[PDB]
Design a binder for this molecule. Sequence first.
Ligand SMILES: CCCCCCCCCCCCCCCCCC(=O)OC[C@H](COP(=O)([O-])OCC(O)COP(=O)([O-])OC[C@@H](COC(=O)CCCCCCCCCCCCCCCCC)OC(=O)CCCCCCCCCCCCCCCCC)OC(=O)CCCCCCCCCCCCCCCCC
Ligand SMILES: CCCCCCCCCCCCCCCCC[C@@H](O)O[C@H](CO[C@H](O)CCCCCCCCCCCCCCC)COP(=O)(O)OCC[N+](C)(C)C
Ligand SMILES: CCCCCCCCCCCCCCCCC[C@@H](O)O[C@H](CO[C@H](O)CCCCCCCCCCCCCCC)COP(=O)(O)OCC[N+](C)(C)C
Ligand SMILES: CCCCCCCCCCCCCCCCC[C@@H](O)O[C@H](CO[C@H](O)CCCCCCCCCCCCCCC)COP(=O)(O)OCC[N+](C)(C)C
Ligand SMILES: CCCCCCCC/C=C\CCCCCCCC(=O)O[C@H](COC(=O)CCCCCCC/C=C/CCCCCCCC)COP(=O)(O)OCCN
Ligand SMILES: CCCCCCCCCCCC(=O)SCCNC(=O)CCNC(=O)[C@H](O)C(C)(C)COP(=O)(O)O
Ligand SMILES: Nc1ncnc2c1ncn2[C@@H]1O[C@H](COP(=O)(O)OP(=O)(O)O)[C@@H](O)[C@H]1O
Lengths: 459, 54, 347, 98, 88, 320, 49, 55, 104
Amino acid sequence: MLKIIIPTTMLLPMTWMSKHNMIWINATVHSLLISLISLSLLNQLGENSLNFSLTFFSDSLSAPLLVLTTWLLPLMLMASQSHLSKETTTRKKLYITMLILLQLFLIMTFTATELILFYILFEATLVPTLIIITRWGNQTERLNAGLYFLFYTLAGSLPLLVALVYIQNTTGSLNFLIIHYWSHPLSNSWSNIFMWLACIMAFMVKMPLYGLHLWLPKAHVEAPIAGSMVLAAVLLKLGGYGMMRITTILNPLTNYMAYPFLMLSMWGMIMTSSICLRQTDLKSLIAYSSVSHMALVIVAIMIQTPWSFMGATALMIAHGLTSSMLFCLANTNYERVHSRTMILARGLQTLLPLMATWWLVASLTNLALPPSINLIGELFIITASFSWSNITIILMGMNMMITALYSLYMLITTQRGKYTHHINNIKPSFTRENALMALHILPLLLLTLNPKMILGPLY
Amino acid sequence: ARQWQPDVEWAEQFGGAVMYPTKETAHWKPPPWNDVDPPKDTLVSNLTLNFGPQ
Amino acid sequence: MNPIIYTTLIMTVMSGTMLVMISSHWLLIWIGFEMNLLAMIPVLMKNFNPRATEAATKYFLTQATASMMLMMAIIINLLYSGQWTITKMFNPVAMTMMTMALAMKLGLSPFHFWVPEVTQGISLQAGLLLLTWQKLAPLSVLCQISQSINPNLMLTMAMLSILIGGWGGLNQTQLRKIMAYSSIAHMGWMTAVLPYNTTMTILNLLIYITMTLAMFMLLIHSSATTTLSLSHTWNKMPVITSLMMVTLLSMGGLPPLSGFMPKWMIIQEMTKNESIIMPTLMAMTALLNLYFYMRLAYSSSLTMFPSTNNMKMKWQFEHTKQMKLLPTMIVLSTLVLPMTPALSSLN
Amino acid sequence: MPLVYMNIIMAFAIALAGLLMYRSHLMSSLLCLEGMMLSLFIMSTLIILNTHFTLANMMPIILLVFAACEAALGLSLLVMVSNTYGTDYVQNLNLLQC
Amino acid sequence: SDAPPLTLEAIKDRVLYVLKLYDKIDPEKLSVNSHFMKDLGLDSLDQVEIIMAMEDEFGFEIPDIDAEKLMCPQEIVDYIADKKDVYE
Amino acid sequence: LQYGPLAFVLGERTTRKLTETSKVITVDGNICSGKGRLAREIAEKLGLRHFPEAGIHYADSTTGDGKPLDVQLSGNCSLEKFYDDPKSNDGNSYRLQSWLYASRLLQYADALEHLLSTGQGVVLERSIYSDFVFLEAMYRQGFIRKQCVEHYNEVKKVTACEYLPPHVVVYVDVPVPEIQSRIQKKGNPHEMKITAAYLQDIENAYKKTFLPEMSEKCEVLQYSAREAEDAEKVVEDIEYLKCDKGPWPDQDDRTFHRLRMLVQNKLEVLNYTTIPVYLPEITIGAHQSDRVFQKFTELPGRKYSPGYNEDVGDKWIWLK
Amino acid sequence: KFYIREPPHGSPDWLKVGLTLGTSVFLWIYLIKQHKEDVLEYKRRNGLE
Amino acid sequence: LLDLIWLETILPKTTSFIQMKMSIMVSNQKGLIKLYFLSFLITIMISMTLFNYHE
Amino acid sequence: PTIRLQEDPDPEDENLYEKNPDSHGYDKDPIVDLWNMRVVFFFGFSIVLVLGSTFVAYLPDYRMQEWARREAERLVKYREANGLPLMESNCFDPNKIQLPEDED
Ligand SMILES: CCCCCCCCCCCCCCCCCC(=O)OC[C@H](COP(=O)([O-])OCC(O)COP(=O)([O-])OC[C@@H](COC(=O)CCCCCCCCCCCCCCCCC)OC(=O)CCCCCCCCCCCCCCCCC)OC(=O)CCCCCCCCCCCCCCCCC
Ligand SMILES: CCCCCCCCCCCCCCCCC[C@@H](O)O[C@H](CO[C@H](O)CCCCCCCCCCCCCCC)COP(=O)(O)OCC[N+](C)(C)C
Ligand SMILES: CCCCCCCCCCCCCCCCC[C@@H](O)O[C@H](CO[C@H](O)CCCCCCCCCCCCCCC)COP(=O)(O)OCC[N+](C)(C)C
Ligand SMILES: CCCCCCCCCCCCCCCCC[C@@H](O)O[C@H](CO[C@H](O)CCCCCCCCCCCCCCC)COP(=O)(O)OCC[N+](C)(C)C
Ligand SMILES: CCCCCCCC/C=C\CCCCCCCC(=O)O[C@H](COC(=O)CCCCCCC/C=C/CCCCCCCC)COP(=O)(O)OCCN
Ligand SMILES: CCCCCCCCCCCC(=O)SCCNC(=O)CCNC(=O)[C@H](O)C(C)(C)COP(=O)(O)O
Ligand SMILES: Nc1ncnc2c1ncn2[C@@H]1O[C@H](COP(=O)(O)OP(=O)(O)O)[C@@H](O)[C@H]1O
């Protein structure tokens, strides 16, 4: 596993010793090469994981997440260098250092064999994100958002630590292989109920679960473009990965304690999708669509079936790609008109036709058009939920109808109609922006031909 | 087209004696720039004595 | 004050602490405390500035009351058993008296009132001394008598200290009072694990001392005692503000920084003794400390406050006297977590 | 325990209560400190004499010495405070808050 | 907290209470606009005594000048309002 | 071995260096007087170091190379613009006054350091003690607000209290019409716009406040325009003074140790000049602060410490 | 150049540099020898060699 | 009603309000030794009775 | 001055097409910008997108799908030949199971 970790570490001295006008080129090239190397982890077994050493292991669930994490870094660098042009050299290097440290922490988090090491890295991911948001955000709300990001997470995850060191004192190990092989049932008691709550709420806050989602529309909106990309694409999936790992020791108690979270997710899906219909901020609309999408992942993890797990993995990867693309598409217009209001700049398809095509494709993937992997994950989750209870089809189906409603609405408001007269600074699209959209969308469509690579360990 | 940074109105919130001013606490004043208070010129009275005539 | 007199007073303070830490006789421990207080009073008054006189008077009264209680506890223990050796304190009433006296010496809640006032009243160097070197002797005495400490009283005082430090730090714009409340909370963390494991107490003390030394030396380097004065440092020394922000993050207990190691090591220990609710309350209460560290990080490093015209003059001059141990202190206070197992060298 | 022992312990408790309850004068509190030291001296001497611990007979004398260092210290501070306010009232020590 | 937000009505009430506490003035007679000399038959030394009583009541030094003109209760209220910066 | 507590412990004392000629001397007077020439002649006759009056770019002459820096990176104020528009709405007047006070404080620290390290006396034109006469005239003419005066007094209260006032205060008294004629003959187009009320206010501040409170701690030597040109008479008048009124004889070796530890380390001298009091005349926004600081750093010899700049010829940097 | 002579300049303090390098070299040599003796003593105690 | 008001009201706004109130209560001490030394006396008596009289 | 400080005016944004009509939107320097475009396109579309997709397409069957199909074919052939049931309801031999003493 060090053949990926060490080059990521070498990105730091390479960035700091680079020339004033070469940092972006070197960072992009070498992050792309690290993505190419990380592609080799997709060669997974059918029975057990890739146990590299006592510390790191790779699995059919974590390999696609690692590939997405390594692929996102060149895209963040490409999208960041435009709004950081007037910046001093040392602060550009510090920004790239934040991105590199975040990538290193995520790579180590997704492969750690031991739950306490996973916890330590999953918490270490907070510092670079907070620094990015509160230092390179644009508005005065970025401070408040940062606090909401910091304390929503910790308040959920501090009990988890207390639970983890508790478990190792009774079972003797926190190694995931030993944890899985030596599994024992969870008895029905108040102590076991609170141990279940301590092991779950930390990941539920990260999803985020409806009710504890208030930090997301602040953090994603107030963060710079790279911050929002990494927050939507990868940092949300940490909760899903942690829940899928830790639900092993929670059975059969999950059969009883999943009801409140299942109801919260199935109703907050409708709530967030309906909120998206009345949103004056385009970035806020995208952020709320993220919560609506992640509620389905929460449901799939809660019901604990192989089909639900496959759907959760596929939906997680597809959502990462789609939401990153949508954030970049919104930022392209933001750097033109310097406002996040959706109805300020209209009729942009007349003035920017190819970017309108990019908008259409991103909206199509957002509403889960077949045969996109978004649709694959959504349909697998819906089938598993239908097996869990037929009445679920009423809610899930409703969500679909709402999801197509606010997606195309978002497309119609910004692309169709007539252009606004006074806005006369809308320049033609750059090759950087077009290439960024293409590198977002091409892997998404390519994954249709080989979906088993994102269907997780239950395939 | 410019990132927001704190101004005087923002900075003045941290210039009081306490973070959250309270009706009673609003009368507290910040300490002097050096930790030196104005010298309390207390009038130390001299003893007045009659010497003589007896 | 003469440099020779200052040096001899500092030597007397460290000699009192050493006499406390090397003695096997209760009378010699009491004598060490007396000597430490006697030499410590003038160090707080090195700069006259009558607020220092107030701080010294308050410190003297508190420490002398604690010393009287300590001597009474010693005498009661001698009465109920003709023993002078420092051991498990055969009488329980004497044990309670000594626990309260040492808590008063340390500044644990609800004996915490004097710490913010004394720290604000003295200079930054005196505050560094008071918040780092002064904790060793009472903690060293507590570690020797831990097997007889009533867990209920000590844990109540520890929880009170954590809560009160967290709450008191929120309302502060003065940096020295912020440091004092941080000190109170860390003292509570130190004494929470003392009845279960003294090695964890020593580890927390060492990590806290290095972080406090880093913070105080950084506040000395940029001569700021308030939030608004520290908000000017970015326009003179950005590196100092960056290192200050990293140290503040470490003191909040955020992984993978050094300040996470004590709490992580304490909670685990408390779990092996079937204490679950207590570590959870302490861990959630430390978020207040984190919040008022983060507010300072916002004011000093993550945003740029307005500056003044005369700061341009300061651009032309360099810091003359340099603290040699500051880089080591910063590195030890941030990048040390991977070497956690070395704690076994402390027992 | 005989009645003399609890009388000395009661004297110590009374002096501690006197110190902890300030009226106005710092000198009154310093007198309470000296009284606590005196009660400690008497108690320790009685215990040492009763049990015929011969070496410990030097202990109370030492206890007296560090009593003076505490008095001379306190008096010194009482001078400085006085020089600031012309009065030894403890209400004047309120520049520093919590 | 410190002293309450004193108003003009408070100033007038205190001034009239002080004036009615003077022996050489009948209480029911004097009005707010009554001159000290013409209506009440007071001389300069009585006015000086009244001004000293005002200084005791409100606790601020009124010099010899800026006291030779405060000749009815009403101008006294105006002077106190101007010195203490009260308007409503 | 830089001076410090260790050097005080082993030997070095300052009272042994003083040889009755220490005599910090300041030579004050109104605008366009003969005080500069008189001070130079006094320093020549008495063998003292002369400090020319501190201007906007005084600090530049002591750091890096003595060449002045750009007005944007140093001062950010203009005396010429102050004469052109004394009531400008950009805050030039008080910014210039505050910068000049800071420069005078730095020069006083430098002079005291020289005297306490070598024992040789120093001569100055003005000082921090006589700077206020320019502030009051600014305030009485309506050029600055009351808040600026309060800020100036706040800065002066916590700075001047740490230093010893001069032994000898020489004043050159020249009437307002004569300095007006000298200004007109001088030829400076900006300096001719000085009103007689401004000069009269400067004189009123000098005579009403400065000299009366300077004379209560040491003797003051007042001279006229014609007798100021006779430098030998002034020098022997200084020679036959009886200095027993100031705190200078009341200074011990430990007080001199504290003062010498303060006069070096100019960052501590200038500590309270930038107090966080936000007046518009001197407060600078974060964006301008950042831009100007980055511009300052890009100066040829200012990026690193004085011995670590490879672009001004420093060598063996990798071994220092 | 500069106004003040800046005594710390192009000629580095060779006494300090020599002392620093000598301390580093002495520490490295001592550590190497200590490791060698430690290995020899460990192999002697355990009957390995 | 839910997202911008009540979900804000219950978890984060209530927490901030309670912590601010507690901070004001804790730090609002005038600095008079006469008050918190009497507090010390109360604490010492409570410790001697509640904890020491039941071991 | 009715303003609270001395601040720079907010500057207007720079159009990269003004000085470089073929700008690619990567950098102000035309040569650095052109090489940034070339390096991004080559290492993203030519190397990772094409060669990576080809590598993933031809990954060897480590999941053992063909192996499982062959084993299933062999078992179906054998069990149909012998007439045994195609699947057994028990995955574990009952002779190796030790149930508790009695049903009550
Ligand atoms: C479990 C294992 C772990 C254990 C952990 C242990 C604890 C960890 C650390 C605890 C916390 C540390 C806190 C440090 C307090 C610092 C306070 C301070 O001095 O000012 C702050 C100081 C102020 O900075 P500044 O503003 O720039 O200075 C301005 C001046 O202060 C302006 O003032 P000035 O003008 O007056 O300048 C005077 C200056 C200049 O000094 C001079 O000029 C020197 C002149 C010489 C004078 C001659 C005096 C001789 C006569 C006196 C004799 C006295 C005898 C007493 C004995 C009586 C016996 C009964 O001197 C000083 O500034 C201070 C002098 C310090 C002297 C220290 C002597 C140590 C005494 C030891 C006693 C023990 C003896 C044995 C006891 C036996 C039992 C009885 O800042 C710092 O010093 C930076 C912090 C550095 C701290 C150390 C970091 C950690 C330690 C790492 C080392 C390794 C430790 C482990 C070793 C283990 C064994 C090998
Ligand atoms: C905004 C989003 C936040 C996240 C939401 C998280 C939801 C957490 C809720 C946890 C769900 C279940 C917890 C415990 C299981 C049952 C709880 C109780 O209601 O059921 C009865 C429990 O009986 C009584 O009702 C006791 C509970 C009454 C006191 C609990 C307070 C409930 C009020 C709602 C509080 C709001 C929770 C969220 C806080 C903000 C069951 O009857 P009984 O057979 O006897 O007990 C069986 C359990 N055994 C096996 C351990 C014995
Ligand atoms: C932030 C990290 C901590 C920094 C601490 C300072 C670092 C500098 C090292 C200090 C030098 C002094 C130690 C070496 C001198 C020899 C020590 C010897 O004389 O004393 C022994 C003691 O040796 C010391 O205990 C070992 C010191 C090692 C300190 C490092 C541990 C740090 C915790 C792990 C965090 C990782 C940090 C590693 C550095 C980056 C005797 O042991 P003993 O008298 O019988 O036990 C006393 C305590 N009892 C009785 C109550 C049990
Ligand atoms: C602008 C003009 C547009 C129109 C004109 C274009 C002209 C036509 C071009 C379009 C081609 C249409 C595609 C039709 C399908 C044919 C290709 C197919 O045969 O290949 C697939 C192969 O597809 C690959 O398996 C999928 C590629 C994997 C995608 C990975 C993306 C690269 C990494 C980038 C990072 C992104 C992060 C993603 C996180 C998970 C079949 O899979 P498989 O059945 O097996 O192969 C059977 C034979 N094998 C097994 C021996 C090899
Ligand atoms: C955004 C906010 C998110 C909020 C997250 C907080 C929810 C966490 C739920 C409780 C956390 C504490 C659990 C500690 C870890 C459990 C380990 C364990 O099993 O210990 C239990 C102990 O369990 C407890 O003591 C827990 C009691 C609760 C104490 C702290 C109260 C915190 C709030 C609880 C109610 C809220 C829970 C849901 C909140 C949802 C978010 C609003 C039993 O151990 P033994 O003593 O050995 O028993 C066997 C031998 N007799
Ligand atoms: C305990 C008892 C101690 C007694 C001590 C007594 C002290 C004696 C002090 C003697 C000092 C004088 O006589 S001082 C000399 C006072 N003589 C004059 O002023 C002459 C002009 N008289 C007037 O103008 C008016 O009649 C006037 C009465 C002033 C009213 O003034 P108004 O028109 O403006 O109200
Ligand atoms: N503190 C000050 N405030 C404003 N202007 C000053 C100040 N000090 C000196 N100046 C200006 O500096 C110019 C020259 O200084 P001055 O002493 O008057 O003449 P010179 O030193 O050349 O004989 C004058 O125009 C004077 O106004």
